[PDB]
C-alpha cells in the first residue's frame, strides 16, 4: 500500500585530474531501473531492469540530457561549496542528493523530499511541507537564501506532486511482474556453541523479496529484541535478500526458543526452531 520513486546523484572531485565523476541512479522501491555514470564510454542514461528497454529513444535522449544537465550543475556546486568552506584544491570532496516521492496505493502522494549531504554530512533539505528548507550550517544557509529568492521550492513541489507521481505509476505497470511479485523466505536455525558454555542460536531468512522482513527470536511465546544480534540485510546476488538474527541461549533450553519470520510472501508467519537431527 506504498511505493516510491527516488533519484540519487553523487559527484566526487578528482584533484589535479580534471572533472568530477558524476553518477545518477534511479529506484522504484529498492530496484535500480536507470543509471548514469560519467566514467562511462559514452555517458548515457541506461536501463537497469528488463522492463525499461521499452521506453522509447525519446525517453533515453531526454533523460540523458537532464542527467548531463545535472552533471554540470554538480561540477559547479563542488566549486561553490569549496568556496563556502574555504577549502583548497588538493582535497577530494563529495556531494550527494536524494529526491523522490512516496505514493500510497490509492495514488496519493504520502511524502515528497529532496535532501543533500556534502562530504557525507547533511547540508540542505526540503521540508515535508514542500515549501521551506532545513539548512545544517552557514554554507547551506547561503544556498537556502538563494533558493528562497528564486522560489525554487515551488518547482520541486510541482514536480513531486505531479511528474514524480505519474512516472512512479508508469514504472509500476511496466514492471509489475518483478516489482509487485512476492518472493517468500526460506527459514532455518543453526547452533554455534560458545566457549562460555552456552550456545548461539542463529535464524536465517533466505531468498526473500522485497527486503522488508521481521525476524523475532521469542521465548515461551514472548518477544526478545533488546538483546538480539542482527546483520544488515544483504543481497544474495540473484535479486533476493537474506538476513540472520541470533540470541545467546543456555544449553538445554535450545528447544524453548522460536524464530518468527514475517514477510509479505508468507500467508502466515514462520515459526522456526533448532533441529539437531
Amino acid at each position: 500500500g506504498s511505493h516510491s520513486l527516488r533519484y540519487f546523484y553523487t559527484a566526487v572531485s578528482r584533484p589535479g585530474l580534471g572533472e568530477p565523476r558524476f553518477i545518477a541512479v534511479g529506484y522504484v522501491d529498492d530496484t535500480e531501473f536507470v543509471r548514469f555514470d560519467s566514467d562511462a564510454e559514452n555517458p548515457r542514461m541506461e536501463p537497469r531492469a528488463r522492463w525499461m528497454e521499452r521506453e522509447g529513444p525519446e525517453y533515453w535522449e531526454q533523460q540523458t540530457r537532464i542527467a548531463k544537465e545535472w552533471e554540470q550543475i554538480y561540477r559547479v556546486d563542488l566549486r561553490t561549496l569549496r568556496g563556502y568552506y574555504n577549502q583548497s584544491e588538493g582535497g577530494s570532496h563529495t556531494i550527494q542528493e536524494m529526491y523522490g516521492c512516496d505514493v500510497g496505493s490509492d495514488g496519493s502522494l504520502l511524502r515528497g523530499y529532496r535532501q543533500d549531504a556534502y562530504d557525507g554530512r547533511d547540508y540542505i533539505a526540503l521540508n515535508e511541507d514542500l515549501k521551506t528548507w532545513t539548512a545544517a550550517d552557514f554554507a547551506a544557509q547561503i544556498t537556502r537564501n538563494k533558493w528562497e529568492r528564486a522560489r525554487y521550492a515551488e518547482r520541486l513541489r510541482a514536480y513531486l506532486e505531479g511528474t514524480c507521481v505519474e512516472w512512479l505509476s508508469r514504472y509500476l505497470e511496466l514492471g509489475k511482474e518483478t516489482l509487485l511479485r512476492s518472493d517468500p523466505p526460506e527459514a532455518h536455525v543453526t547452533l554455534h556453541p560458545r566457549p562460555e558454555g552456552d550456545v548461539t542460536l542463529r535464524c536465517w531468512a533466505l531468498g526473500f523479496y522485497p527486503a522488508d522482513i521481521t525476524l523475532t527470536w521469542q521465548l515461551n511465546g514472548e518477544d526478545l529484541t533488546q538483546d538480539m544480534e542482527l546483520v544488515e540485510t544483504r543481497p544474495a546476488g540473484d535479486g533476493t535478500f537474506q538476513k540472520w538474527a541470533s540470541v545467546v541461549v543456555p544449553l538445554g533450553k535450545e528447544q524453548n526458543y522460536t524464530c518468527r519470520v514475517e514477510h509479505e510472501g508468507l500467508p502466515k508467519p514462520l515459526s522456526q526452531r533448532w533441529e539437531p537431527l
Partner: peptide, 9 residues
C-alpha cells in the same frame, strides 16, 4: 523521469 528545473547551490 527526473526533475529538470534545477538550480545551483
Amino acid at each position: 523521469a527526473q526533475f529538470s528545473a534545477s538550480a545551483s547551490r
